């Protein structure tokens, strides 16, 4: 599910950037089932950010994101997030975290990071999360649990 995961990342990040008034196309040059997954992920990310908007922006600010340091800050946080296993809530939090890094990157005039973060997220999904996802019934399991 390599390309469907990339598409999920692009869709979610595009959505989170447009909520801040920013356009994905300025930062990168990138049927019925896929759209239900995307919608469920958008709704879950909004719900996460509804109750934790300060906590997310606080911790991203505390990470002092720069082009020279963003990759290790992303990978270290995500490695700790999943260190003792995976569940769907942690996967939504993983998307929300990457969305907050991208927003912070445009805010701080580091737009080059947006497409980098998207690649890092897609790589992490495909290499480290997709086995658990498939073992747990695929993304339709998420739609059934988190979809509204």
């Amino acid at each position: 599910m390599s390309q469907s995961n990339r598409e999920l990342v692009v869709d979610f990040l595009s959505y989170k950037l447009s909520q801040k008034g920013y356009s994905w196309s300025q930062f990168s040059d990138v049927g019925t089932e896929s759209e239900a997954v995307k919608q469920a992920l958008r709704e879950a990310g909004d719900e996460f950010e509804l109750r934790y908007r300060r906590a997310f922006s606080d911790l991203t600010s505390q990470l002092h994101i720069t082009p020279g340091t963003a990759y290790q800050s992303f990978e270290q946080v995500v490695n700790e997030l999943f260190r003792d296993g995976v569940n769907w809530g942690r996967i939504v939090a993983f998307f929300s975290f990457g969305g907050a890094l991208c927003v912070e990157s445009v805010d701080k005039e580091m737009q080059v990071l947006v497409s980098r973060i998207a690649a890092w997220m897609a790589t992490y999904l495909n290499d480290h999360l997709e086995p658990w996802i498939q073992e747990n019934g695929g993304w339709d399991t998420f739609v059934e649990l988190y979809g509204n």
Partner: protein
């Protein structure tokens, strides 16, 4: 059954907040070491960011599982539509109080960190801020456990009134 659903969600939420508190306490005591290199300080912030994200994800996962179990009960008819309303409202409230506790713990840990950076170097003057943070964090743990049991207890008593 609907009573086990709200109970299991409450215990899980309280448990994730306790895990968060224990990590933040542990991270704050490492921020006390005088040998803390800038490298270790960067890694403590990454662990703090990850602990907050994990708590958010794990609390939400418990609530979504609980709501799914609740919807299964009404479609199996083990709960009517008024009892489902009450159980879903109680799960919503548990998410609210648990989320507030998580946000609280994060803010207080940030405040405790900022105080350590303006305080001295000796053990005294900011072991005080370390003890203070541990004190506030225990209070948050206890209040959340109390609310979690109390809210589930009250859900039961008002079911009979349906």
């Amino acid at each position: 059954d609907a009573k086990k659903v709200a109970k299991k969600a409450a215990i899980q939420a309280a448990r994730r907040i306790t895990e968060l508190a224990q990590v933040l306490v542990e991270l704050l005591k490492e921020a006390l070491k005088l040998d803390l290199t800038q490298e270790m300080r960067k890694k403590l912030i990454e662990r703090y960011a990850a602990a907050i994200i994990r708590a958010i994800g794990d609390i939400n996962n418990a609530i979504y599982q609980a709501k799914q179990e609740a919807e299964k009960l009404k479609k199996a008819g083990l709960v009517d539509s008024d009892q489902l309303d009450a159980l879903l409202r109680a799960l919503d409230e548990l998410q609210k109080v648990a989320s507030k506790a998580a946000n609280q713990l994060g803010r207080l840990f940030e405040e405790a960190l900022k105080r350590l950076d303006k305080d001295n170097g000796g053990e005294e003057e900011k072991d005080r801020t370390a003890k203070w943070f541990e004190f506030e964090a225990r209070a948050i743990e206890i209040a959340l456990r109390l609310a979690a049991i109390g809210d589930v207890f009250d859900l039961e008593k008002e079911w009979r009134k349906l």
